[model samples]
Target: VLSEGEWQLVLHVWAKVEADVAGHGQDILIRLFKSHPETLEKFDRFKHLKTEAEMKASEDLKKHGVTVLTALGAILKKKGHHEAELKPLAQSGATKHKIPIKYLEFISEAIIHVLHSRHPGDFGADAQGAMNKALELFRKDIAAKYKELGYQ
Candidate 1:
């Protein structure tokens, strides 16, 4: 697991991406890699997308970002400036990412099962370390996204 300071950096990166991209989380992903230069490995799945499809996805992501930001604005207005108010909704919307934090408990459990099923030792720590590394890479990418969007 990451130390508190490391995770706090991750959280701030997430919050900033959430604030800046709103619903178009993909732009956060795209712009993130564009700025960070090191996060392009996560989306190897879509590397073969044609130019037209890529363009379409970008447009879709833009619309999605606008929608999410607008909804988040409403949420903030209703919740009286409580950041935690958006946690639930954010978790739900996190499905766009391969593993949503909403199911973090279940996800952790599942990872444990997979790890133990493969090996005999307590690999949870190792798995968590890998996860944290992935998250930190993503967080760095997110900071890059903020840079691209002109956020200081």
Candidate 2:
């Protein structure tokens, strides 16, 4: 859960980026693949794609990226609640994909990376700390789901 001040800070930074949450979704995906190219193989949408440029232009990438970003945006907007809604979300995706919890870490890292690269000076310590709080909660729920599903 985010503190009152932390909630404000996280939302404040997200406000600058919310307009293009969809637009920059790919940027986060691209950043992740650049580091963990094999992750592309984990997704049905991206497994077929081979080339960097091909992935860059694919609709699958765009749609999945938007999906991830939208989910994340909703999660960040929550104040200390929504476990009931989120638990199933964690399990449902956690349901199908063999993808481990670690990618959640990678995705969050890329998200912060893209945001930082997009607004370096604007994302000072206060905002960064706030984002970290939100993301760790996001990861914790996903990790909890993973645990129930018999994953590490």
Candidate 3:
């Protein structure tokens, strides 16, 4: 179960993804919907998601999925407690979304470091700062693409 504070962070992450999806497209929303159906209630367009085949039929959806997943994971892990459960969303398998396995591992590790760093008892400020920097860099790399796609 998530603490109230942790719940706040989760909501923040959800809002961030929703804003990005609104400005960009449903790329992040769709993968997130698939990865964690529970979060669907928070999204305004949750009722509109078509089946995988229907979503996949859109060329843009297939092309932009990785960017969306990457963005969602990065944001959620920034101050998130549910990182472990969401970790698999970053994974790849023949029957899965096929995100590059190595890159997904890196993303998971980087986020774990963030969780460790930010939890006051787990690590020192220096380590926390470094992980925060990595998280920020990841966000920077993704934010631009969203912006280019007209996402605020």
Candidate 4:
């Protein structure tokens, strides 16, 4: 669970990072695909855009990035009140994507990397820990729903 102070820090950092929504969101997805190329195979539309330049130029990638970042932004905005709303959204995403919980977990790493890259001075240990814990909580909620549906 994230402490109130930690939640505040996360919200602050995320607010700044998302100021340029398209840039930051695209960066996160690009970094994730770069680090884990195999993960791209899961996305039928994205898989064909093998090169990084092609992926970045594709409208589909931009749309996907916006959708993902918007969902994450919603969760942060809801913060303490997220359980009632965000969990359902996450579960729906899991069912629709048919993606494993482990793969989803990579979002944390991608988020952290992008945050640090965007604001190296702002992303300290405390901030990093808060983001990790927040993502873990979110991931657990999504994973629970995935399990309920008998998905691995």
Candidate 5:
């Protein structure tokens, strides 16, 4: 649960950089893959993308990145009104990919890194904490469904 101010901070930061969603999402995914190279093997389409450059250049990567960021944008837009929207999406992803929770943590960490890199001065501790809490909330929601479905 985030304060109104914290939610506003998220919106403000996203508004500033939303125009570069493709690049931002690409960067986040690239950082994740770089940090945990073996994680890429989980994706049949992405597994063959052995190099960062190859992944970056792939249309599939771009499309997936855009799709994810777009969903994120929708969540931000709805905020409190549609918090439940995330659970089904998360459950579907978990069931489809059998993705481990660690990957979600990695993605969250990468997102925070991208936010800091994009807005070094503006993304203060408060904002970081808010984002962390928000990510944790999502993780818990997703993890519950994952566990219920007998997935890791």
Candidate 6:
């Protein structure tokens, strides 16, 4: 739960990039996969990407990226009130999708990186901390789900 000012800053900063969510999604996933190759292997679409250039050319990756980003937009647009829905999302993510919960932090870190790149001036230290707390909130629920389901 961020302070009112923090929420404003977070939402305001997010507003600029909202229209470019698809592109930002691709960019963030690129960093996620690039920085953590094991995560990249988790995605069947990226398994064959042997090089950076190959990854940039991946249409499947782009589609998946947009789907994730838009879904995230759904959570964010309603403000933090939609947070309760993260449970089912994490359940399916950890169960059928088999996504290791640690990647929440990985993706969150990538998000910070992308946001900083996009709004280096306003997204300062305070904003970064606010963003990380919000991201970690999701991670906490995802971690709880991972534990509940006995996911390794």
Question: Residue 53 of model 4: what lDDT?
Answer: 92
**Per-residue alpha-carbon lDDT of model 5 for 1-152, expressed as tens digits?**
77888888878777856879888889888888889887787778888887888988998988888888888777766655554777777677767767788888998899899989988787899878877777777777777767777785
Which portions of model 2 miss their true places by more than 4 Å? none
Candidates in order, TM-scores: namely 0.28, 0.89, 0.27, 0.91, 0.88, 0.88
lDDT of each: 0.41, 0.79, 0.45, 0.81, 0.80, 0.78
Q: Which sections of candidate 4 miss by over 4 Å?
A: none
lDDT of 2 by residue, 118-150 (tens): 987878888898888888887787777778877
Clashing pairs in 5: none
- lDDT minimum window of 10 residues, candidate 4: 85-94
- Estimate candidate 6's alpha-carbon lDDT, on a 0 to 1 scale: 0.78
Candidate 6 local lDDT, 1-152, one digit each (tens): 66777667777777877878778888899899888878976777578888767776788877888888777756655556764666677778777878876777789889989999988997999988877777776677668767877785
lDDT per residue for candidate 1 within 1-152, as digits (tens), equals 34554444433333433554533344433443444333334345544444434734665545654664455444433322333544444343343443323233332333234334443343345444643554344334334443444441
**Candidate 4 lDDT by residue in tens digits, 1-152:** 77899998898788887788888888889988898887887888888887889978988889889888887888877775677766666566667767767677776789999999888888899888888888888888777766776774
Q: List RMSD in Å for every model shown.
A: 15.4, 1.8, 15.2, 1.6, 1.8, 1.8
Candidate 3 per-residue lDDT, tens place, 15-127, comes to 44444443233433355556556544443433455686676566555445546555555555555433443344333222243333334334445444434433445444554
Error of 2 at 31 (Å): 0.7
Ranking of predictions according to lDDT: 4, 5, 2, 6, 3, 1
Please name the candidate that would achieve the greatest lDDT relative to the true structure: 4
